[PDB]
Amino acid sequence: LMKILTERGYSFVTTAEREIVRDIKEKLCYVALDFENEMATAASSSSLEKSYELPDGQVITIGNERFRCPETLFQPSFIGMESAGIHETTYNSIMKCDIDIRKDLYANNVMSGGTTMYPGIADRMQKEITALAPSTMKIKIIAPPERKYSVWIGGSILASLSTFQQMWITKQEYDEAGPSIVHRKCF
Amino acid sequence: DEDETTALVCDNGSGLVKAGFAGDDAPRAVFPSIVGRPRHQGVMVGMGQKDSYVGDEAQSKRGILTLKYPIEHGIITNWDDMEKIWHHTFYNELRVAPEEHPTLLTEAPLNPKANREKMTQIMFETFNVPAMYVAIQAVLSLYASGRTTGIVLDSGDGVTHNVPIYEGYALPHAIMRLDLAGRDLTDYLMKILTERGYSFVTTAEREIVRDIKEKLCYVALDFENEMATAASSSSLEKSYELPDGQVITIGNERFRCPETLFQPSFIGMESAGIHETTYNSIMKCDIDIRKDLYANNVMSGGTTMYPGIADRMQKEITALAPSTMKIKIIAPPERKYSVWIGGSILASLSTFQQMWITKQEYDEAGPSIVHRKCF
Amino acid sequence: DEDETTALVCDNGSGLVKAGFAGDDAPRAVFPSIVGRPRHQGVMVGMGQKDSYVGDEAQSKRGILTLKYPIEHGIITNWDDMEKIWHHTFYNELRVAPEEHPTLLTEAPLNPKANREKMTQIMFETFNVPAMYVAIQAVLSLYASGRTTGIVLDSGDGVTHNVPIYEGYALPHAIMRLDLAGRDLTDYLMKILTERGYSFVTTAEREIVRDIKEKLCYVALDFENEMATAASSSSLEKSYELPDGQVITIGNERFRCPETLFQPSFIGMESAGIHETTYNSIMKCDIDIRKDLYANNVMSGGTTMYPGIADRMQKEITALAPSTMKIKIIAPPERKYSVWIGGSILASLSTFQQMWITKQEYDEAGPSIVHRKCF
Amino acid sequence: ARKLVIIESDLERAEERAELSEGKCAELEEELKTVTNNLKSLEAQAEKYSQKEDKYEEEIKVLSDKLK
Amino acid sequence: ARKLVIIESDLERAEERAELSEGKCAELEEELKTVTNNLKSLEAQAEKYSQKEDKYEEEIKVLSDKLK
Numbered sequence A: 001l002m003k004i005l006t007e008r009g010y011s012f013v014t015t016a017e018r019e020i021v022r023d024i025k026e027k028l029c030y031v032a033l034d035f036e037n038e039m040a041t042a043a044s045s046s047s048l049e050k051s052y053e054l055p056d057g058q059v060i061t062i063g064n065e066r067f068r069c070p071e072t073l074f075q076p077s078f079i080g081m082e083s084a085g086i087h088e089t090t091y092n093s094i095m096k097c098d099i100d101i102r103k104d105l106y107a108n109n110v111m112s113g114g115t116t117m118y119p120g121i122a123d124r125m126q127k128e129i130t131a132l133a134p135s136t137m138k139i140k141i142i143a144p145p146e147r148k149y150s151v152w153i154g155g156s157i158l159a160s161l162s163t164f165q166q167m168w169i170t171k172q173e174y175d176e177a178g179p180s181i182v183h184r185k186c187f
Numbered sequence B, C: 001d002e003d004e005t006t007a008l009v010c011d012n013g014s015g016l017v018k019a020g021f022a023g024d025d026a027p028r029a030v031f032p033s034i035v036g037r038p039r040h041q042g043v044m045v046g047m048g049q050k051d052s053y054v055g056d057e058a059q060s061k062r063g064i065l066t067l068k069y070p071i072e073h074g075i076i077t078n079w080d081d082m083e084k085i086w087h088h089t090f091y092n093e094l095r096v097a098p099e100e101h102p103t104l105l106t107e108a109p110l111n112p113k114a115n116r117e118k119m120t121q122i123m124f125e126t127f128n129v130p131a132m133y134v135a136i137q138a139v140l141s142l143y144a145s146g147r148t149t150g151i152v153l154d155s156g157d158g159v160t161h162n163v164p165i166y167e168g169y170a171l172p173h174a175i176m177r178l179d180l181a182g183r184d185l186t187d188y189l190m191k192i193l194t195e196r197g198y199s200f201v202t203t204a205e206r207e208i209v210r211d212i213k214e215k216l217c218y219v220a221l222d223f224e225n226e227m228a229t230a231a232s233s234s235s236l237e238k239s240y241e242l243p244d245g246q247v248i249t250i251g252n253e254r255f256r257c258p259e260t261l262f263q264p265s266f267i268g269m270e271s272a273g274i275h276e277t278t279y280n281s282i283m284k285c286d287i288d289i290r291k292d293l294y295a296n297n298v299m300s301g302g303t304t305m306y307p308g309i310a311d312r313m314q315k316e317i318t319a320l321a322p323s324t325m326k327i328k329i330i331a332p333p334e335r336k337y338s339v340w341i342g343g344s345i346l347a348s349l350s351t352f353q354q355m356w357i358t359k360q361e362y363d364e365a366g367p368s369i370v371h372r373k374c375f
Numbered sequence D, E: 001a002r003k004l005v006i007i008e009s010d011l012e013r014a015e016e017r018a019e020l021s022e023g024k025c026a027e028l029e030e031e032l033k034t035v036t037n038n039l040k041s042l043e044a045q046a047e048k049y050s051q052k053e054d055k056y057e058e059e060i061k062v063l064s065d066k067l068k
């Protein structure tokens, strides 16, 4: 974001204010549904110009700056890479597995991580996935509402499991098989 | 139902298992014969994988299953799996114990002598079966009509059998055993589809071929005339939008594979069409036996439901064969259960006692007791 | 040289193109198959970018090239680029016009029918080619020794082919097509290197893997015994100071990737090792055909130059197979050009007239003229 | 606050129109499944009938020759 | 403000699945009419083929008698 803000003059240089960007981001910034149609909307000053008086003392009208950065997600070409949008990588993980495995994968897609709380992150998936992919099953993505702690919910479980004994490492087990004990036995 | 031991009825093949309750007319539970592993690692803890998955359970979710075929014509790569396949049938659905009721099975003609004993060992030693038997596929489809003079051709997924069983059984050779049925058809299509680009690789989608096959695919009446018809896009291009999401216009692919039936030359063999093998079983027997054989030809097996399978027989048989009697082939409409209809009979016969095997009879004459006395 | 049209010799794959002058023995120009864009903006005016960069030009300077792969087994994402790839070969180096000399190409077995016509369309319609042909990879490597009874296994970057072509071609299935060669090996290493931290991400350095591979990497004779050897730091830790500036001690990484060859289970498939597929092509044919097949097994393809690729075959083949004949595999030393050696022949044959296609022949029988008549 | 009340008025309208369509769509699909079942059934019979007449005319042709 | 967005989003989601369902439902409804017409047409032809091959059955029979 700080790199792209330089086009307007704003340049949050040091790494301290760099964090302020992250703080401000998670309050108003959102993802572009379709950058093409939203660009023509810039003519209006209602849905664009957003108010956020710096706690310091200088307003930053984040209008076309909100839905500009997230575009990089779908377009990694803006960060020097050949990686395609997250909807291509979806195919990349589906085309590899068996043929009779897909119909049920589309019926269930778990999306975890608090990063997936940006307004306009889930509705875009249905647009790009249904495009270049089989279209005769139930396309369905499970994006847990509070999906940031989804790992923490599962964490409290493993710590309480008894079968966990079959997996965990004991004091002596670390000395018998050396340091590699961990990822030399498990996966 | 309650009184009298009451025996079950079953018919195991090399592709589809047929089994139901007792004293029934038709199979009540026909689960597919599949058992693979999770080459993948099951979630490993999201159950201690094991169960290669089977029954409607496996067939429902092939995706993550490396379907491993145990029974391939004669040789069973592994018997350990078969034990837990039969532990599901009698209990999970039928809810009855084999340690209480007799049992009936089918015999694949010309099967290694060691196999018929290995199976019985599982019953007598562990599942305690004081009474059971293993009858011969084709002969069962017979005893269920109204005559003692007909030739039968029974087959499905195992191997083809041209058994002219009418007045008696076994004399010179007549009967034939041909490894070319069901599973062979499912294996051949994927190879030929590669010419168009389509390549159903793994063994999971291999089954999808069989599923799609039994809905539209048909047999070529005359490949010569049907080839010129390809110019048109009405009788050829068939619609079948993959449940996944990609149409496959099976036009010239439908009546291409079945041609192999009449032309085994396309599968590396000298075997002639099924209309030559017909002669091969007729020319051997006596001279004054033919006129009535043509008047009755039993065609059993659900494989003979492909559109264009019966009408072709009248064209090829009447060609290079005597032509002054009544050429007539009995192709039962639902000829897949013809064996099951006959199975329910043997299990209820009393003369059956003259044929079946009793607990003690297996120990007195040793393991060979079965095919050392009967045929 | 001058008199007689004099035909060229070529062999295009899905990774490396082999082409030279005419009447030669070996390829004179072997440029890499790469064509990307300047995702970056070329200097945009410091030439109107375009040229995705190709030939020694692109390979010399990958850095600022988003190498876009056009030909992926069967499907060509875009044909427009292929047009200007062939406009460089015949002219920039060979300095000869295809509108004067015939042309010879290779056929990737089981390739979509629509592709063989799309290519020919580029020649006949634009490059005016009154005479050309497209022969089958493996069969060419054959006709170049001294016998009419040998089984061939030809592959490189495209897909693996187990073709038992000796006395004839095509009968039941025998032959096999497996998408697991060259490009597949280059793609698998980067994934496994991530376990140590090394992650060659972009497709540019992806090629560096292939370059480094063909200098030190070798195949595991027996992964079990070689694992215990890891304790020592002599045969494992290999030196290769990155031309950039960071050593990569490829010790247990060299003989780890090749294991996938024998164990396709590591790439999500049911395909068995290459020694099982060998049986898969032998068990199908006649019984009295084997004893001489083992006595001769042709192994073509530069891929079979990895140290520890031939000695392993004798270990696995002699295991689960008949063992009373002469087990013998012919692995030509320089077996990469085995196809090129055979190519120079077909282009010079006169009987070739019985097989090749003439200008008018393409219009009389339509586009399908090629694979509608030949095989 | 007022906009919060207005936005809800349009939501219920789309939900009902979607449910009403799904109701008929499922019925049409079920009907299609029944029709297509008889379609191929009649086609099979039509092909069989065509096979019969072809064999009949062929035999009749022979009967005529023998009659003469 | 957040509640508004949640409901406003539901409107876009409800409107999307509505126009998509109705669009396909209308296409399906129109297709059924075409398939139904084909069914009636094929059924009619099958009837003509059935009554024809039956006429040959009685024709080939009477000719067999005259031949005898």
Ligand SMILES: Nc1ncnc2c1ncn2[C@@H]1O[C@H](COP(=O)(O)OP(=O)(O)O)[C@@H](O)[C@H]1O
Pocket: B013, B014, B015, B016, B017, B155, B156, B157, B158, B182, B183, B210, B213, B214, B301, B302, B303, B305, B306, B336
């Ligand atoms: N309606 C049908 N039409 C044509 N073939 C069918 C039909 N239903 C089943 N089949 C086929 O019949 C075969 C299974 O028949 P079955 O008698 O159970 O064989 P087997 O006993 O040899 O295992 C499979 O090839 C299957 O595709």
Ligand SMILES: Nc1ncnc2c1ncn2[C@@H]1O[C@H](COP(=O)(O)OP(=O)(O)O)[C@@H](O)[C@H]1O
Pocket: C013, C014, C015, C016, C017, C155, C156, C157, C158, C182, C183, C210, C213, C214, C301, C302, C303, C305, C306, C336
């Ligand atoms: N000296 C070598 N040793 C081992 N592999 C080699 C050697 N030279 C080339 N190769 C490999 O051979 C492959 C290219 O062989 P080639 O016959 O041109 O394949 P294709 O025709 O399938 O494109 C590449 O994987 C390359 O790394």
Ligand SMILES: [Ca+2]
Pocket: B013, B137, B154, B155, B156, B157, B158, B159
């Ligand atoms: Ca059978």
Ligand SMILES: [Ca+2]
Pocket: C013, C137, C154, C155, C156, C157, C158, C159
């Ligand atoms: Ca190759």
